[PDB]
RNA sequence: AGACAACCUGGCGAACUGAAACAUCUUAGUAGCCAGAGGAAAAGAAAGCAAAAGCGAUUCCCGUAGUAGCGGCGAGCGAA
RNA sequence: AUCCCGUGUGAAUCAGCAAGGACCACCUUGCAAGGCUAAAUACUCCUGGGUGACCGAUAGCGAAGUAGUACCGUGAGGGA
RNA sequence: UGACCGCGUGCCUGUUGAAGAAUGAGCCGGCGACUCAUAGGCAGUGGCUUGGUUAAGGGAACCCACCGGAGCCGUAGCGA
RNA sequence: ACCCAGAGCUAGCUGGUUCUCCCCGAAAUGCGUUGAGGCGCAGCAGUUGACUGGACAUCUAGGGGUAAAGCACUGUUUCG
RNA sequence: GGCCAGUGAGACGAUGGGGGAUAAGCUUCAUCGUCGAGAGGGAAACAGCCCGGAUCACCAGCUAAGGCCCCUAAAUGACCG
RNA sequence: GGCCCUCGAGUGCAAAGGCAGAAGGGAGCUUGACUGCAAGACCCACCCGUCGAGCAGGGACGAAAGUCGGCCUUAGUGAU
């Protein structure tokens, strides 16, 4: 019956105003002392999910309002 | 327990609180040999809450 | 009205005798497929990425207040002495 | 007849790190484009050209890359912008892209 | 007193399965057995909801919503 | 938090008691530890009336013939 | 009908490769397999575009005129 | 033990999957995997939109340390 | 870039090598051919070699690879060894 | 102490690539082993990794021009 949302995944993929899926980067929870100032700044920020993995993410949670660019 | 990361706080911005622009101790965690340099480190460094270039006291 | 695919009724109709599923293996068999998002035992994306700051224990997402209109959007709905432009009239 | 096979003590490596010349000699570059990932200074830094922490050699300005001769048995890399770059509608490429465009427009 | 298709109330209460293994978890308080009674049964007339605005016992449908949530924060479960 | 329970403790009485998702204060709401109660709701061994882009004897109930028969099984049971 | 000539390694499955001495069928006739319900995405088609649409529920039942605007989707993002 | 029920248990495994013509047409690789006869993503099909110019051919410019060759370096080697 | 697949056992041959015994119709990579998924002709028969890519009809013709004593299409052809 | 080839030395730690008045050896003064970032590239299935001109602040060292966001470079490491 009416699709349950994959609320394990949902909590890692937000969608932006224009409609792109966005995630947080992996790496910077602990063992921070040994990494640079530089790379922690790139690991702070959000970027798109790669076009490859859209299929799995959209497929998991089907109430997103997500526009693959068309 | 031979070469260890250690907690360089500030002596500048010792722990205060109130009045919106909150003070909030700066900190630097970095490594020294425990055996080589037995007395605690006392480096000078930048602290973005002081806006100066304070002494960063060692502790634990 | 398209007229669909009654599937597996001769090799001329096309999708016949195995019915466009190739040759054995997990996706061929009857029944449910897999988990969706499953990466094969490799750690799935949806479980090797951290979870979006606020939504990670409490903090209700910023659900919008106020029902925003704009001055640009009002002008199209015209009235001279616009008697109380409010929740009623709009 | 069925004797035991002796194990090896080998079988370790690292997958090739992909060093070498990324932007070749007499070729386009950018402000910030990595020209060479070299492990030591095989090539040396010339004019208009940064040299990084890893002896990575990158261009600061536009222009084409140049591999000069250093003196006693070494190599340099400098970058030079180019003055005027002419295009003639006479040529074959120009003829054919306009022909193609005109076909595209003609059809639709 | 016994009998009686299902529905229903109460007692006891599985496992295969799903989690690509598995013990938390899921299957499920389901199947089964046991006892009980009616045309329905159970519920039910606020030590209740809700928010400074109000509603007035239950029960059932649409909806809110697959939202708030819970979850080896996994599989899944999921309100008012 | 709210609701119910084995063990042990063990209050108060509207200058009260309980709830408002630990908890305290202030507001608001209600009155627990006695009972009863139609409807809308669930179902088909079954009766009457109607309907079918349902079946037509390898179908439709297992069963269009005196079928749960003949037959098998110690027996539960299976079964044309 | 067929003097005699030339050609011509049963079918299926399934393989790198099967006339295969790999598998399957004694023959003949019947039965015998991607369906349905509900949701999500996409395409084709249609209606409306004063934005669109109603759910339950009501209808000399069922369809059905005609009501029902409760909700849903679109009209503002940014940030935990 | 049997019989009935959960129960059409599950089976990344084997077998099987039925009318016709026309158009295009692969792969048997890399990466990860309690994974190796499974699955994911890439690579290579079809189909439908958008962006442009390449394709095959000849001619220049670039950095290469391989075949060759060599004994100045690193080893090895025979005779004086 | 949208929608939606199969594949993820490969095989042999040429070359460049590794492993092996510079054994294997052996094995593993790299570049290319064919099979796989490709009929026809040459190879007696003969997936993988050579030629050549089958829309269909003709009791027409020219040729590729390969051949011209008979089985069995074409020279019991030629000149020199 | 002189002479002669001169980089065969050394470069914390395996190897390869590097390094001359040096990246090798010594001395003075210090802490840029710093906050806020970042045009732009490399590497790739995804996850990850890598180089970074320059700007902002506040310092270091020098007479000044300038150089400094750890180490001559490639290992010293783990997502959720």
Short mmCIF file of N, CA and C (backbone and C1' of nucleotides) in Angstrom, two decimals, chain C residues 26 35 38 46-47 51 60, chain E residues 20 68-69 73-76:
data_model
loop_
_atom_site.label_atom_id
_atom_site.label_comp_id
_atom_site.label_asym_id
_atom_site.label_seq_id
_atom_site.Cartn_x
_atom_site.Cartn_y
_atom_site.Cartn_z
N UNK C 26 19.56 -13.51 -9.51
CA UNK C 26 18.64 -13.01 -8.51
C UNK C 26 17.49 -12.20 -9.09
N UNK C 35 16.78 -5.24 -1.43
CA UNK C 35 16.50 -3.95 -0.81
C UNK C 35 16.74 -2.88 -1.89
N UNK C 38 20.28 -0.90 -2.14
CA UNK C 38 21.28 -1.91 -1.77
C UNK C 38 22.42 -1.88 -2.77
N UNK C 46 23.40 5.64 1.62
CA UNK C 46 22.48 6.01 2.67
C UNK C 46 22.90 5.53 4.08
N UNK C 47 24.03 4.83 4.20
CA UNK C 47 24.60 4.51 5.50
C UNK C 47 26.12 4.71 5.58
N UNK C 51 24.49 12.72 8.68
CA UNK C 51 23.07 13.10 8.52
C UNK C 51 22.74 14.56 8.91
N UNK C 60 13.16 20.18 15.25
CA UNK C 60 12.16 20.11 14.19
C UNK C 60 12.61 21.03 13.08
P A E 20 20.85 -6.71 6.18
"O5'" A E 20 21.29 -8.22 5.90
"C5'" A E 20 21.75 -8.69 4.61
"C4'" A E 20 20.71 -9.60 4.01
"C3'" A E 20 20.90 -11.11 4.23
"O3'" A E 20 19.70 -11.74 4.70
"C1'" A E 20 20.35 -10.66 1.98
P A E 68 8.63 14.48 9.65
"O5'" A E 68 7.74 14.64 10.96
"C5'" A E 68 7.63 15.91 11.62
"C4'" A E 68 7.00 15.72 12.98
"C3'" A E 68 7.80 14.92 14.00
"O3'" A E 68 8.85 15.68 14.60
"C1'" A E 68 5.55 14.20 14.03
P G E 69 10.39 15.24 14.43
"O5'" G E 69 10.62 14.25 15.66
"C5'" G E 69 10.88 12.84 15.50
"C4'" G E 69 9.91 12.05 16.33
"C3'" G E 69 10.38 10.66 16.72
"O3'" G E 69 11.09 10.74 17.95
"C1'" G E 69 8.27 10.51 15.67
P C E 73 22.62 1.59 15.64
"O5'" C E 73 21.43 2.57 15.21
"C5'" C E 73 20.45 2.19 14.22
"C4'" C E 73 19.80 3.37 13.51
"C3'" C E 73 20.68 4.53 13.03
"O3'" C E 73 20.43 4.83 11.67
"C1'" C E 73 18.69 5.34 14.00
P G E 74 21.36 4.24 10.53
"O5'" G E 74 20.94 2.70 10.49
"C5'" G E 74 19.76 2.25 9.78
"C4'" G E 74 19.89 0.78 9.45
"C3'" G E 74 18.68 0.13 8.81
"O3'" G E 74 18.74 0.37 7.42
"C1'" G E 74 19.50 -1.25 10.54
P A E 75 17.44 0.23 6.52
"O5'" A E 75 16.95 -1.26 6.82
"C5'" A E 75 16.46 -2.12 5.77
"C4'" A E 75 15.89 -3.39 6.35
"C3'" A E 75 14.38 -3.41 6.55
"O3'" A E 75 13.76 -3.79 5.33
"C1'" A E 75 15.44 -4.15 8.53
P G E 76 12.74 -2.80 4.57
"O5'" G E 76 11.34 -3.15 5.25
"C5'" G E 76 10.62 -2.21 6.09
"C4'" G E 76 10.56 -2.73 7.50
"C3'" G E 76 9.47 -2.12 8.38
"O3'" G E 76 8.26 -2.85 8.26
"C1'" G E 76 11.55 -1.91 9.47
#
